[PDB]
Every structure is written in structure tokens, then in C-alpha cells.
Coordinates of C-alpha atoms and ligand atoms in Angstrom, one line a residue:
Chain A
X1 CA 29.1 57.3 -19.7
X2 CA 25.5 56.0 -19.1
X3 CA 23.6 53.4 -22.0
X4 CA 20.6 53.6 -20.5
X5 CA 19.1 57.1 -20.4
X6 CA 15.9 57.5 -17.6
X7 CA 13.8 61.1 -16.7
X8 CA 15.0 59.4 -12.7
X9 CA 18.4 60.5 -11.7
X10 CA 19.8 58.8 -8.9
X11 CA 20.0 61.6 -7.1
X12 CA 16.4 61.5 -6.7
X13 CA 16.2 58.2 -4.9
X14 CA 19.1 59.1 -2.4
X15 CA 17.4 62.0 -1.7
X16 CA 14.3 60.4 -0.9
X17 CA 16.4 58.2 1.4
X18 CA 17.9 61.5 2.5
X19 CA 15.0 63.0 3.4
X20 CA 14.3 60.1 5.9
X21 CA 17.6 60.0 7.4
X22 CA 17.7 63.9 8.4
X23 CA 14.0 63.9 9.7
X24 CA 14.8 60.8 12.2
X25 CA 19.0 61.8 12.7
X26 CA 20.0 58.4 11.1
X27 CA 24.0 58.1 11.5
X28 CA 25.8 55.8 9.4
X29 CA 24.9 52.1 10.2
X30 CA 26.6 49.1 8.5
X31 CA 25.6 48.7 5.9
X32 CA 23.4 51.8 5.0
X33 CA 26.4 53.0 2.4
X34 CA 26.3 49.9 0.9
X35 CA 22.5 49.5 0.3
X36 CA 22.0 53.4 -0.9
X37 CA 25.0 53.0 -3.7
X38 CA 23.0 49.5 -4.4
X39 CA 19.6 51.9 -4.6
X40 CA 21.3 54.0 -7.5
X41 CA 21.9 51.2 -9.9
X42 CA 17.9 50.0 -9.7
X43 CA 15.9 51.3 -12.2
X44 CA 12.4 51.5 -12.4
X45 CA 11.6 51.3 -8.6
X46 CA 9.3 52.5 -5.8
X47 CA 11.3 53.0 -2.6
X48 CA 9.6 52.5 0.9
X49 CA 10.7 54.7 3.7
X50 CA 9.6 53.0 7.5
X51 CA 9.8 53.4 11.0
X52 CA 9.3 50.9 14.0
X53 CA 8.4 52.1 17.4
X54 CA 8.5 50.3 20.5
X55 CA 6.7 52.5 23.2
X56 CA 9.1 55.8 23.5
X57 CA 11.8 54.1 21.1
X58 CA 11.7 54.4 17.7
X59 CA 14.1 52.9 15.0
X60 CA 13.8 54.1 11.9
X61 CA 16.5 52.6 9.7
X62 CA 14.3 50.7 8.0
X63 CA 14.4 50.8 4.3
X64 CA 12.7 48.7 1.3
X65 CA 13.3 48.9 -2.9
X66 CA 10.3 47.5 -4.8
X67 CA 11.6 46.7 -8.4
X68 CA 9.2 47.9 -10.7
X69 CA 10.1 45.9 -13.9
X70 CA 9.4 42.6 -15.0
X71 CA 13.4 41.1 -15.0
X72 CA 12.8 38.9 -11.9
X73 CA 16.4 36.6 -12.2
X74 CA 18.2 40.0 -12.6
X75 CA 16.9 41.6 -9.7
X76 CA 17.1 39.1 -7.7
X77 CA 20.8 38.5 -8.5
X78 CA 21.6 42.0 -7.6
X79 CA 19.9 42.0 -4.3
X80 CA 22.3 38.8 -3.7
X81 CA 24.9 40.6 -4.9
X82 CA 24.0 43.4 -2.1
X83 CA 23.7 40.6 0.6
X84 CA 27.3 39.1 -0.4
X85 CA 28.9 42.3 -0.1
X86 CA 27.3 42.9 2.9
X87 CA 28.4 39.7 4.5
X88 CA 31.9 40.4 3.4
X89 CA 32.7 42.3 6.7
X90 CA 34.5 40.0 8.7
X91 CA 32.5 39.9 12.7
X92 CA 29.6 39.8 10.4
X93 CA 28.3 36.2 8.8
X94 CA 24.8 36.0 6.9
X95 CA 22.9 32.7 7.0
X96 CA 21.5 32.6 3.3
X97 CA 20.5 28.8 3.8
X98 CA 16.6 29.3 4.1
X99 CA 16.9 31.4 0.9
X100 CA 19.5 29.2 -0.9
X101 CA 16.5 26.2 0.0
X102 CA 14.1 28.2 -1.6
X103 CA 15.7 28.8 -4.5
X104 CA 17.6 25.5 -5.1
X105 CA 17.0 23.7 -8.1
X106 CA 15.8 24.8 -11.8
X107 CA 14.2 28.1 -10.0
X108 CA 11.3 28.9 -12.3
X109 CA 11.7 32.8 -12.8
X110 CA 8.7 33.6 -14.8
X111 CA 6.5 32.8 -11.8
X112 CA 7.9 35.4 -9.7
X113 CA 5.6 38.8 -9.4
X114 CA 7.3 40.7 -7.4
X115 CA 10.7 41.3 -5.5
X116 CA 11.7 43.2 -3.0
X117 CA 15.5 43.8 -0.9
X118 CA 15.7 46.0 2.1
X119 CA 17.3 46.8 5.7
X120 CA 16.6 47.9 9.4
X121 CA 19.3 48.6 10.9
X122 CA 20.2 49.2 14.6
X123 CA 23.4 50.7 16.6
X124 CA 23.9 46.7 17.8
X125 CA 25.4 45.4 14.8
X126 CA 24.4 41.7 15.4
X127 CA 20.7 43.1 15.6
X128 CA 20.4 44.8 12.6
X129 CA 19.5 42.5 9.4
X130 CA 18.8 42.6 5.6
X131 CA 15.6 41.8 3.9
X132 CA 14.4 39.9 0.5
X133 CA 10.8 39.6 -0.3
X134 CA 9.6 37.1 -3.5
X135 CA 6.3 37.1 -4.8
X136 CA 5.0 33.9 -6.7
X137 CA 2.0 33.0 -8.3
X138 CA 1.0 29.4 -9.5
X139 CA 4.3 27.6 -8.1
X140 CA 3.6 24.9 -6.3
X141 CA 6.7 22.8 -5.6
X142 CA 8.0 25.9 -4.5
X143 CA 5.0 27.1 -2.7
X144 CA 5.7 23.9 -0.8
X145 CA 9.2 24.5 0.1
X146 CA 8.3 28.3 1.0
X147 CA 5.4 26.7 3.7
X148 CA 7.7 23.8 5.3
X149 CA 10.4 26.1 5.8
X150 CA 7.9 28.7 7.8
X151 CA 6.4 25.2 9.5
X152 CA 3.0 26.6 8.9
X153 CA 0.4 24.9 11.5
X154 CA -2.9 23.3 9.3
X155 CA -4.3 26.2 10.8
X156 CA -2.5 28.9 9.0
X157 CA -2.2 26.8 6.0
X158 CA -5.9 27.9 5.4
X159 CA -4.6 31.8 5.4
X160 CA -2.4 30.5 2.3
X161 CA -3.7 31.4 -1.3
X162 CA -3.1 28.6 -3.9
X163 CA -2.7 31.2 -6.7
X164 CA 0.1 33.7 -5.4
X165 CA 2.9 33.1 -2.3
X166 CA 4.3 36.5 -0.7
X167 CA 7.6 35.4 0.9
X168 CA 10.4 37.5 3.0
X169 CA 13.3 36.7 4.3
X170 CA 15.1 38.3 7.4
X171 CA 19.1 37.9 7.6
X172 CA 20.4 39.4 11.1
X173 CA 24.4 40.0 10.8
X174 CA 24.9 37.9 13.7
X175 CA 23.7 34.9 12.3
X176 CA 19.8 34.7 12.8
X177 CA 17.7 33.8 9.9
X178 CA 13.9 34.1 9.6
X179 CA 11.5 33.2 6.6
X180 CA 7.7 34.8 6.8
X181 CA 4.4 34.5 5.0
X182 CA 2.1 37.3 4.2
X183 CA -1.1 36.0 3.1
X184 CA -3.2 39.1 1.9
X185 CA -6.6 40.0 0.5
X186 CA -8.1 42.6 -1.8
X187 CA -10.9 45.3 -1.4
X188 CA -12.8 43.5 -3.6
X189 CA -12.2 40.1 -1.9
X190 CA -12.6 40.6 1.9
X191 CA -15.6 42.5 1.3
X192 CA -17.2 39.2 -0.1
X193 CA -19.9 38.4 2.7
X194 CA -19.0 34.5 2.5
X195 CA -15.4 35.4 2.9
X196 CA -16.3 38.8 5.9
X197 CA -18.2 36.4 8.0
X198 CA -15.5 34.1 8.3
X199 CA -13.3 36.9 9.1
X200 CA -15.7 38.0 12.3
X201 CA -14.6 34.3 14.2
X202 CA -11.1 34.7 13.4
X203 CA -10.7 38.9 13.9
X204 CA -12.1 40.7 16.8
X205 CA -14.3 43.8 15.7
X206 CA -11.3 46.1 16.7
X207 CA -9.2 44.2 14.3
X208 CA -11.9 44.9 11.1
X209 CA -12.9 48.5 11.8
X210 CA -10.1 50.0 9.6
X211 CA -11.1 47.5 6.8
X212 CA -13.3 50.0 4.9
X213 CA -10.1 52.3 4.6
X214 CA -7.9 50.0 2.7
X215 CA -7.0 48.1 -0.6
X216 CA -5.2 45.8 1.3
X217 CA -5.6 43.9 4.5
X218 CA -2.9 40.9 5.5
X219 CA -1.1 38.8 8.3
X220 CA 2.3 37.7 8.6
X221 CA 3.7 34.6 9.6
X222 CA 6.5 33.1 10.8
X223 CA 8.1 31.5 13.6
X224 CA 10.1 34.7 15.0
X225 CA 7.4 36.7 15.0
X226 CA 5.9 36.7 18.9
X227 CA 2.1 36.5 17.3
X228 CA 0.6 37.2 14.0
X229 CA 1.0 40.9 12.5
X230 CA -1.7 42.5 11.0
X231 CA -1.3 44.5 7.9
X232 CA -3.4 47.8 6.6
X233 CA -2.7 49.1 3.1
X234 CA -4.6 52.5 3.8
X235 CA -5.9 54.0 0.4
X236 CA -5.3 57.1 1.8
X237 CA -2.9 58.8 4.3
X238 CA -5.2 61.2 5.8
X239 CA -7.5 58.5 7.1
X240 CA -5.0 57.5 9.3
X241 CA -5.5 59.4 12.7
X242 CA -8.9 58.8 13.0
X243 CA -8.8 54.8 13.3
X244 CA -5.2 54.0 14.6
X245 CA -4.7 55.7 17.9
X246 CA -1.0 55.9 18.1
X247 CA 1.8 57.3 20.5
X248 CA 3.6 60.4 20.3
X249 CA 6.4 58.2 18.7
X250 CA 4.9 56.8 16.6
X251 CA 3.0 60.6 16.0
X252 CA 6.3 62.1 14.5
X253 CA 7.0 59.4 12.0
X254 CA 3.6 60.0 10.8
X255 CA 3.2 63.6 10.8
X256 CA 6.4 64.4 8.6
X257 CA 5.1 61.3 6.1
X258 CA 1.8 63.4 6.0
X259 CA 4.0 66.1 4.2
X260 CA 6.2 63.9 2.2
X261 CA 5.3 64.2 -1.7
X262 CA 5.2 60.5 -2.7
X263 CA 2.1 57.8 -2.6
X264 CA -1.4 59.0 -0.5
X265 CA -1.2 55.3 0.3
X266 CA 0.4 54.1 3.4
X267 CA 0.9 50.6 5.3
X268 CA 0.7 50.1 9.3
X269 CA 1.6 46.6 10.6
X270 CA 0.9 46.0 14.3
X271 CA -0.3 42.9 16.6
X272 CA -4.1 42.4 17.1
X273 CA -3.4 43.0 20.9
X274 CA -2.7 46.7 19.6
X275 CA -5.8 47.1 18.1
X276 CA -7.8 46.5 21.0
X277 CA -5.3 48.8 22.9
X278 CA -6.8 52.1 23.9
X279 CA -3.5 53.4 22.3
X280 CA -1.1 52.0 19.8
X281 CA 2.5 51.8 21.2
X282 CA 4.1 48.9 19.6
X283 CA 3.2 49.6 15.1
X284 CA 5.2 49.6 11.8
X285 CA 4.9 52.1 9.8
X286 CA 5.5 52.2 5.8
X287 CA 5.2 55.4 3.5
X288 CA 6.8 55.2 -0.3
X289 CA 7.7 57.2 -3.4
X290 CA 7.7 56.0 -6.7
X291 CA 10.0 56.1 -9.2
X292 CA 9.6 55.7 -12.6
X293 CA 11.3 57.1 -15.8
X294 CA 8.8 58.8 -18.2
X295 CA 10.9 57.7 -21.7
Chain B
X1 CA 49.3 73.1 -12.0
X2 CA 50.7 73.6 -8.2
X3 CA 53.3 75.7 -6.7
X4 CA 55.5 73.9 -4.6
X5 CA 57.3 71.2 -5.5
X6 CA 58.4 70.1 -1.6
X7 CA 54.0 69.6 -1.3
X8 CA 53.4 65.9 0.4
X9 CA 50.8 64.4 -1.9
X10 CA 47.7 63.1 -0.1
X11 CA 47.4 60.0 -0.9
X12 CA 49.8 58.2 1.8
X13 CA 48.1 60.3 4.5
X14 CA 44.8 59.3 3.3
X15 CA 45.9 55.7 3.1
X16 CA 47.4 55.2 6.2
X17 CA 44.2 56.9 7.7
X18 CA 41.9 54.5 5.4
X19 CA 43.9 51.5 6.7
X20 CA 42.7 52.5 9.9
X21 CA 38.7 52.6 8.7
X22 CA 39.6 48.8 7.1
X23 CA 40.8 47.3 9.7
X24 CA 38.4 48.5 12.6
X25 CA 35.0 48.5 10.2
X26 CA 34.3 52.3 10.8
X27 CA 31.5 53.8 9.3
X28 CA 31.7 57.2 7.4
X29 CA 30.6 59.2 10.7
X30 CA 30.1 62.7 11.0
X31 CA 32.6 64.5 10.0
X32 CA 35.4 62.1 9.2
X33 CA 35.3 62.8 5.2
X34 CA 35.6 66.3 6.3
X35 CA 38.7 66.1 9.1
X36 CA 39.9 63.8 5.7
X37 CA 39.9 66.4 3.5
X38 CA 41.2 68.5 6.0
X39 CA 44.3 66.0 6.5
X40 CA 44.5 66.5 2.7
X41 CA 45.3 70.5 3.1
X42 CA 48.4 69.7 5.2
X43 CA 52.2 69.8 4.9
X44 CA 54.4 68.0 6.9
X45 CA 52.9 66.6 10.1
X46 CA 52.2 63.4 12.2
X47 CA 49.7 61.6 12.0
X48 CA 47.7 59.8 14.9
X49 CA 45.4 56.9 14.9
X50 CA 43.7 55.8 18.0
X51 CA 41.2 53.1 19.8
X52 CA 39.5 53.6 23.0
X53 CA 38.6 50.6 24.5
X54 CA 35.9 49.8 27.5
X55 CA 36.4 46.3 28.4
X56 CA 34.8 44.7 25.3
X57 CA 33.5 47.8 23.7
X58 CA 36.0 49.4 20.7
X59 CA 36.0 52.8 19.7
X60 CA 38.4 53.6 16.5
X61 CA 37.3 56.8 15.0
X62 CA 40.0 58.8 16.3
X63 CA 42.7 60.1 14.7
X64 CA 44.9 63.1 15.3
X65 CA 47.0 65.2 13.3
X66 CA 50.0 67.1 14.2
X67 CA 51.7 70.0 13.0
X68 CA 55.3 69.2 12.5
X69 CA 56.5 73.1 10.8
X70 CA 56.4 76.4 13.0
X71 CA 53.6 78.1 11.3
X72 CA 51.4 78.6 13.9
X73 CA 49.2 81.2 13.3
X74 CA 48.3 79.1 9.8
X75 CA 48.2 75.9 11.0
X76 CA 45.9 77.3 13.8
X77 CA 43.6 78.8 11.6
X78 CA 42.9 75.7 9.1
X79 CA 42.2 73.9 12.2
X80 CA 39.6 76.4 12.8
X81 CA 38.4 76.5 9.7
X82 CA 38.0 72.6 10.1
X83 CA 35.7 73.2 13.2
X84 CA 33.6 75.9 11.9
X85 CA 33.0 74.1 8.5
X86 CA 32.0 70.9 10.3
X87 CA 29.6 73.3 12.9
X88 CA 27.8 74.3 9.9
X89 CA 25.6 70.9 9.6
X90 CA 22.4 72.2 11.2
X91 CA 21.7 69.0 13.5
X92 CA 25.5 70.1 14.9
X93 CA 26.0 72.6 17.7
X94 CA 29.6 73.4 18.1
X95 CA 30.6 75.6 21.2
X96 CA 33.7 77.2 20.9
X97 CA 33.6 80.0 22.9
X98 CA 36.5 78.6 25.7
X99 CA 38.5 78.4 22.2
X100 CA 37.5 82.0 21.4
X101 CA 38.5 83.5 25.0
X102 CA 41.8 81.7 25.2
X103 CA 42.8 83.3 22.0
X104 CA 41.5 86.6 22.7
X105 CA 43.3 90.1 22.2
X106 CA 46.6 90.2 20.0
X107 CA 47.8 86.7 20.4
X108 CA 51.4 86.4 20.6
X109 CA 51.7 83.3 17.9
X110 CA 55.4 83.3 18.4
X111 CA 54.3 81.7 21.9
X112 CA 53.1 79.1 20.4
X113 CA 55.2 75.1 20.4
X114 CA 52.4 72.7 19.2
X115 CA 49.8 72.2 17.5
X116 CA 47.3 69.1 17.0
X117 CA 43.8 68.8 15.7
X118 CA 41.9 65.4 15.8
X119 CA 38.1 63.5 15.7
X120 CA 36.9 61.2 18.7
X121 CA 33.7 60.2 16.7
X122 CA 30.6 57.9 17.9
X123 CA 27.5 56.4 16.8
X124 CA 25.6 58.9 18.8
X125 CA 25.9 62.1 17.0
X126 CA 26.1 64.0 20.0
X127 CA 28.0 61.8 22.1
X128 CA 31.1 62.9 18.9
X129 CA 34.1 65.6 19.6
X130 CA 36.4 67.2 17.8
X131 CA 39.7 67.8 19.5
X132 CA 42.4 71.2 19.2
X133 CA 45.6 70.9 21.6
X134 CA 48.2 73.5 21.5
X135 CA 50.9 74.0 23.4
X136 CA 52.2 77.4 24.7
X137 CA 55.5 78.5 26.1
X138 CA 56.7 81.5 28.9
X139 CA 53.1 82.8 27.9
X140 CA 52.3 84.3 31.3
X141 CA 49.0 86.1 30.5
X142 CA 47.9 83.5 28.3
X143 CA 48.5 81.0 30.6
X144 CA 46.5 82.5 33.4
X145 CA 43.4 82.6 31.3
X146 CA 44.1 78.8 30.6
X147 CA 44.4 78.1 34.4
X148 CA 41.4 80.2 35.1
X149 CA 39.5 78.4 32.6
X150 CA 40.4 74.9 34.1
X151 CA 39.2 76.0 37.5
X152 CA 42.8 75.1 38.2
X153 CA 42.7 73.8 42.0
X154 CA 45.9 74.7 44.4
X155 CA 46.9 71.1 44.4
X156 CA 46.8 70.8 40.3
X157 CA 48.9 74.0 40.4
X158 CA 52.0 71.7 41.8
X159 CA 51.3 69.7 38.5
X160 CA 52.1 72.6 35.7
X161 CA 55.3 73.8 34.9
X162 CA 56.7 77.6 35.0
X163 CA 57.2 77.9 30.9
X164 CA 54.7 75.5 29.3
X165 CA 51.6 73.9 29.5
X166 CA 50.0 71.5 27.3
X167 CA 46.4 73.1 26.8
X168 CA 43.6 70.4 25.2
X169 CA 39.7 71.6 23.6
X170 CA 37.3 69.4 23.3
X171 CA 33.9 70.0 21.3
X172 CA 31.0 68.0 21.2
X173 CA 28.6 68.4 18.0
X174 CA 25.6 68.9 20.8
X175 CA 27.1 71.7 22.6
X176 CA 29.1 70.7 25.3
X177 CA 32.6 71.8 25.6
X178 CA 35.5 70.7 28.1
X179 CA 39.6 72.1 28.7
X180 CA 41.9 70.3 30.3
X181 CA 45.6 70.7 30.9
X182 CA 48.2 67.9 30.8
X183 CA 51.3 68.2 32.8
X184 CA 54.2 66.5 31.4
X185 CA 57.4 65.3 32.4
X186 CA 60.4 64.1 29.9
X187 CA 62.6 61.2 30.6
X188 CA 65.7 63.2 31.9
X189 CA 63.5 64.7 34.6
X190 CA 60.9 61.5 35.6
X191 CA 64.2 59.5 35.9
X192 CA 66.2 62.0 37.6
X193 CA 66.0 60.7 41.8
X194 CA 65.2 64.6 42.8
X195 CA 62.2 64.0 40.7
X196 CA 61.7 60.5 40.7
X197 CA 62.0 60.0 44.7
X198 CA 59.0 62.5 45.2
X199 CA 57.1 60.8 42.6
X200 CA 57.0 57.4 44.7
X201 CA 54.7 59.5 47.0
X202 CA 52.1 60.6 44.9
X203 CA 52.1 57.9 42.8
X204 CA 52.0 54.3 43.2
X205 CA 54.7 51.7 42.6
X206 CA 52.8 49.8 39.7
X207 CA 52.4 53.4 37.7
X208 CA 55.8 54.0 38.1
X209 CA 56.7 50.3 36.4
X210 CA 56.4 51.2 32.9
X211 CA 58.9 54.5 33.1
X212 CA 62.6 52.9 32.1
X213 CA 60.5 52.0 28.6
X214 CA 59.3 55.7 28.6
X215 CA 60.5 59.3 27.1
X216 CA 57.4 61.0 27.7
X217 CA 55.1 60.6 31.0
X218 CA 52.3 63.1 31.2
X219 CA 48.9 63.5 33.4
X220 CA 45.5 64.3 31.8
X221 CA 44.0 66.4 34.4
X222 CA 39.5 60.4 37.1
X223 CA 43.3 61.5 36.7
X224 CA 44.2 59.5 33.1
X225 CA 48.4 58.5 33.2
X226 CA 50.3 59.0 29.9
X227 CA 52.7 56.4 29.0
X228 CA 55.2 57.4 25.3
X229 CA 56.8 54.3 24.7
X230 CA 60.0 54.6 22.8
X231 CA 59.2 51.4 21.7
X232 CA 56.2 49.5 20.8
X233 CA 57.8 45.8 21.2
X234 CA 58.2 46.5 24.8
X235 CA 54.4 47.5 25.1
X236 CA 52.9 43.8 25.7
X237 CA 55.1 43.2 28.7
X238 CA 54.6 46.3 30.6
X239 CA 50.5 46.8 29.7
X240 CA 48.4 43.2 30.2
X241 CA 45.9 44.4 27.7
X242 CA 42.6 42.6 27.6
X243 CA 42.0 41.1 23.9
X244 CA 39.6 43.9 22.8
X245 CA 42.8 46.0 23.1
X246 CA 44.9 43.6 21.7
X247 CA 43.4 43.4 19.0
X248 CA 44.4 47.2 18.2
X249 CA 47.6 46.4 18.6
X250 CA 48.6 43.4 17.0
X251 CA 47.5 45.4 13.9
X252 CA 49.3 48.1 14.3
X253 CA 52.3 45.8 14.9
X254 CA 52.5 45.0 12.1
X255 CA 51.8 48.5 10.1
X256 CA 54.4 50.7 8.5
X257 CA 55.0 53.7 10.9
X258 CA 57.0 55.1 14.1
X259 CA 58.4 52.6 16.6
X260 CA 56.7 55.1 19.6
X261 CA 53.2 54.3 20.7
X262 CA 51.2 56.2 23.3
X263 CA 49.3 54.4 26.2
X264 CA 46.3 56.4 28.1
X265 CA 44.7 55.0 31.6
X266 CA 44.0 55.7 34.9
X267 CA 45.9 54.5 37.9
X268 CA 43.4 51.9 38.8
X269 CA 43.9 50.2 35.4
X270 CA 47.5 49.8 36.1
X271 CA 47.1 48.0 39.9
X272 CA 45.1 45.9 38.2
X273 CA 45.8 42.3 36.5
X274 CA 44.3 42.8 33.5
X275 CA 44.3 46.2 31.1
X276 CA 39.8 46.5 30.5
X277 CA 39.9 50.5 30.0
X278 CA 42.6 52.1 27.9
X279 CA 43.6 54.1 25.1
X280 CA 46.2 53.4 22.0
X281 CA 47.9 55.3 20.0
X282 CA 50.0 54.8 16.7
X283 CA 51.2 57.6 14.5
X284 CA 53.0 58.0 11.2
X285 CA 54.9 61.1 10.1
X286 CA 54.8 62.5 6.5
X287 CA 57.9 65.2 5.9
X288 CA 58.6 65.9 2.6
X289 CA 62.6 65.8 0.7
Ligands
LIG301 MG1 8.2 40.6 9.9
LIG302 MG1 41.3 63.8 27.3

């Protein structure tokens, strides 16, 4: 049968996927089937479970696959593969143009860091949509490309780093296309004091209190977003509670993650209005499980 | 290694329901793959597919199955069994106590005419059903529980005839649990001016329009109007269908498969110009050589 032999069966990763579905009563949604018989061909892979809540709604379709090897051009033709099949359903039609324009031309492969493909999926069929994220580092003609098609302000182009690009692409089924930018920093680079200070006149104080908690701190960009997101990568999950003040909604996505065996980290995404909220009702929330064969 | 040589294969009852899935986009809900494997225990029978449409809105996962041999008592109890391994998903809560009093006591299975078993599934898990119909004749004390089960009211009564009655279940995975009865009249007796004259009272003219195209007319007891078409090219004439609904049917135009359809809808839908809320419904039978 099988050439490849892992210690990761891929009964593992649809469980993990299984898990999520029972704890949040996720029916069939086109095309969940499709993207979970995609998520047992992947090999080495961390899989991200998520959940968006919108005051007292919640949708929690949401899905991402991290590849964790280095074959770029083969895991990004796969996740193509998933987003062609997808689009083969006939009321459905993907616009791939904003990712064909990205990666039109010689496409340099050895620059990419880090891919990822995913879905959030809603009972409206033309409101659901499929996900691609790139990484690159030291690319700039593509760099370029990547910031005209977000038609990044001067402004924001100061978010941008030089060295590395973190690109995603959303593909509703009815048509809609999106490109966004997540400019990021480190632990070890937004605690810098010449780089903090700067962050005091662009962040209100509510905004930077949960900085000490994390690895990772970004904002996303794009035109379809109604203002910049903020990102958290918490270092651990049990810090959570105690700086992000969130509904009961959100409370149940949380609390069964707090249970989960998987990562201690954990990612929250949220508008800076919601941090200066008294209570978080509008948040993303991200929780994930590697998986990685031990031969 | 089987037994009986006469045994239907499968595969062309699993086909003709899968063309049904291909066509309409339907997602495996909860529990087509089992009411498919299910399908796959059968011998010979008929087999249903459906679309319910509100104005714009399609719903195809529904498809019924019935028994076409006069083993009752079995073909009763797979269609149990059916219902009570589908119950045993713990997010699903299937009542079927109304089930359980109606066939109460020693019951007489030779009473029994028809049997049908189907799915009426939905995105929401609870909003789902699954369906049992069975059809009893010159049952008296079995039809009195039915009646009393109904809440039969004096002026339904008038509806039911004296030796049958069409008796329908309906369980939803969150609980809830509904019986109906479905008075029926065949073409010799809606057609038939003792039968039909009266009918001109209680029913209105445009209701009464589709019958010379009809064998079976029936009531679902809004009051929903049966219509069994001997034949479906004379459907489009009789039934202005909005294209939501039209698109159900031009398919099934064109799909091997009986010349009957079936045409559910209340008497509003026919006084009105255009068909927004209606049921379809296409069948196929399987009998073995
Ligand atoms: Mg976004
Ligand atoms: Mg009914």
C-alpha cells in the first residue's frame, strides 16, 4: 500500500478535526469532506483548530494546515489542487486571480518559509471561503506585487518588514476575493525600547498590556478587513483569562481548548476597539496540535 | 457466498440515490450514509427522491423507500432498526414513543398494506426527521389509537375512510415528534360525480384542475393537497412551478425511472399564478427476475 511509512496515522489528524467538530456540532459544510480527505495526504503538519464569535454567534468552521516541511512548490500545488476541486461544484466559482498575480512568472520557491491552506465555512454557501497563506523572506519583486495588490497606504508600508512577507489569501465561493498582510514582531524585537516607544503613539496602552504574555504580536491588513486586527501569539494558554475579558461565547471555545492536548500556545485576533472594550465580544480564536512523525 | 439468487444487488439503488446527491450538491448529512446502507439491506421496493422548495430556497435530502413484498412484520422491523441505530449518535434525540403506542399489544401484522421509510434531512441537525408511513386496513382498534393520537377533530373524521388509513411518523433528531393521517381518494372515486360533485364544495375549482391527469389525490392532514400524476409530461402544464422547482424537474425529466410523479402543496399555492412552495417527487422501482 503506503511508500512512505510515518509514527502519524491519518486517523490522528481527522480526529483532531473531529474533536472540534463534535465540541461546536459542526454539520457537513461544502467543502469540509473535501478539505479533511485533503488533510490526510499532508505529512508532516501542525493543524489549527479556530472559532469566530460575533457577540452570541459563534462560527466555528474554521480550519488551517501548517505544512511542516521544507517542499514549498509541492505544497503549494496541493493546496491548489484542494482549491480546484473545490471550485468544481457548479453554483460555486473561485476567483484565484489575486493569487494567480502573485504567483505569475518564474515564482522563486526557495524564498517561501512557510505555507499554509485552510477554510471557514458558514451554512450560506456564497459566505463561506477557502484560505492560502505564503510566507517569503528576501523577495522583493514579489514583495512588491504582494503590497500593490493589498494597496498598502505609505502609512502601513512602514508596518512591512523588508526581510520576510506573511501573505493570505481569502476565496469566498461566491466570488469575493481578498489578499491580506500580517506584519509581525518577536519577543525579542518589540521589547527593543527604540522600537516599544514607537509602539506607545501607534497602540493605545490597552492594546500593549498582553504584550509581556506573548512570542508574537502582529496586525493584519487588507482592504476587506473593517480596521486593522490585532494578533496575540500567547506563550501560554493559561494566561489567557486574566488579560482578554471575553464573552460567554467566546468562553466555551476557550474552555474546551484549555483541555485539548496539543500546543500551551494559543492565538487571539481582535480589533483594537475590543481591547479597550470592558468585554471582548467580537475575537478569533486559534488553538493547534502538532503533528510530526518520529522516524 | 449469499443465499438467494432473486437478491437485487445494491448498486443501482445506491446509484440512482447518488444521482440524486450529484445533481442537488447534498452534503453527507446526518444520517444519509446510514438510511444508504439501510437502502442497501432491501429487496424489492420503490424508491423515492424528493425536493422541497420555499420560493428560492431547495431542500433535496429526502428520499423514501418503499416496501414493494408483503412482509410486514420484517420490513417494519429493519425500519426500526434504521431509527434506533441512527438515535444512537449522542447529539441525537429520537422520540419514538407515538411509534411505540401505535404498535402496542399483539399487533395484527396481517393488517398491515404499506410500508415506507424515508430521511427529510437539513443543515440544522435538529431541524432533520426521519419519516415511517404505514398503511393499515379494517384495523378497528388500531385505528382508534391512530385517531386518538391525531387529536382527530369531528370535521377530519369526514376525511378517513371506514377500512384504511394512511398513518405517517415523523422524528426529529432533537426530540420532537409529529402523526398525521392522509386521506386518500383513487381515480374511480374522485372522478365519479357522487364524489366529485360534493368535492366542488369543499374544495376550490383551481384544486380540482389537475384531477383528469391524476390516479391518486390525497390530503395531508395548513391542509397540504396530494397530486399522483400518471404522467410526468403533463406536469408543466397543470403546476406553473417557479424555477427553483424547475429546476428539480427538468432533471428528473430526463432520469431513467417511473413515468408517475408526486406533487405536494397547499390550496393557496394552487389559486395562485405562480408555484413558490411545493414538494416533488420521483421514484424508481427495483424488483428482481
Ligand atoms: Mg483576515
Ligand atoms: Mg407531511
Amino acid at each position: 500500500s503506503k511508500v512512505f511509512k510515518s509514527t502519524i496515522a491519518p486517523e490522528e489528524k481527522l480526529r483532531y478535526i473531529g474533536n472540534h467538530k463534535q465540541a461546536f456540532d459542526i454539520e457537513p459544510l461544502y467543502p469540509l469532506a473535501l478539505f479533511e480527505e485533503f488533510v490526510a495526504t499532508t505529512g508532516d503538519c501542525i493543524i489549527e483548530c479556530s472559532g469566530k464569535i460575533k457577540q452570541d454567534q459563534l462560527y466555528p468552521a474554521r480550519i488551517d494546515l501548517q505544512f511542516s516541511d521544507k517542499h514549498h512548490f509541492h505544497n503549494i500545488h496541493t493546496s491548489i489542487d484542494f482549491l480546484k476541486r473545490a471550485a468544481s461544484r457548479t453554483d460555486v466559482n473561485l476567483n484565484l486571480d489575486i493569487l494567480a498575480t502573485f504567483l505569475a512568472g518564474n515564482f522563486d520557491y526557495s524564498k517561501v518559509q512557510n505555507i499554509l491552506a485552510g477554510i471557514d465555512l458558514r451554512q450560506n454557501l456564497g459566505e463561506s471561503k477557502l484560505k492560502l497563506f505564503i510566507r517569503i523572506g528576501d523577495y522583493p519583486a514579489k514583495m512588491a506585487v504582494a503590497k500593490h495588490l493589498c494597496n498598502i497606504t505609505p502609512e502601513s508600508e512602514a508596518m512591512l518588514r523588508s526581510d520576510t512577507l506573511h501573505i493570505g489569501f481569502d476565496f469566498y465561493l461566491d466570488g469575493r476575493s481578498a489578499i491580506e498582510l500580517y506584519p509581525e514582531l518577536k519577543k525579542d524585537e518589540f521589547n527593543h525600547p527604540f522600537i516599544y516607544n514607537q509602539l506607545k503613539t501607534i497602540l493605545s496602552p490597552e492594546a500593549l498590556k498582553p504584550l509581556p504574555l506573548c512570542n508574537l504580536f502582529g496586525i493584519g491588513l487588507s482592504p476587506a478587513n473593517e480596521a486593522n486586527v490585532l494578533y496575540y501569539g500567547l506563550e501560554n494558554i493559561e494566561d489567557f483569562l486574566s488579560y482578554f475579558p471575553i464573552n460567554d461565547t467566546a468562553r466555551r471555545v476557550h474552555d474546551f481548548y484549555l483541555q485539548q492536548e496539543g500546543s500551551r500556545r494559543m492565538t487571539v485576533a481582535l480589533s483594537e476597539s475590543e481591547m479597550k472594550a470592558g468585554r471582548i465580544n467580537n475575537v478569533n480564536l486559534y488553538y493547534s496540535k502538532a503533528f510530526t512523525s518520529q522516524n
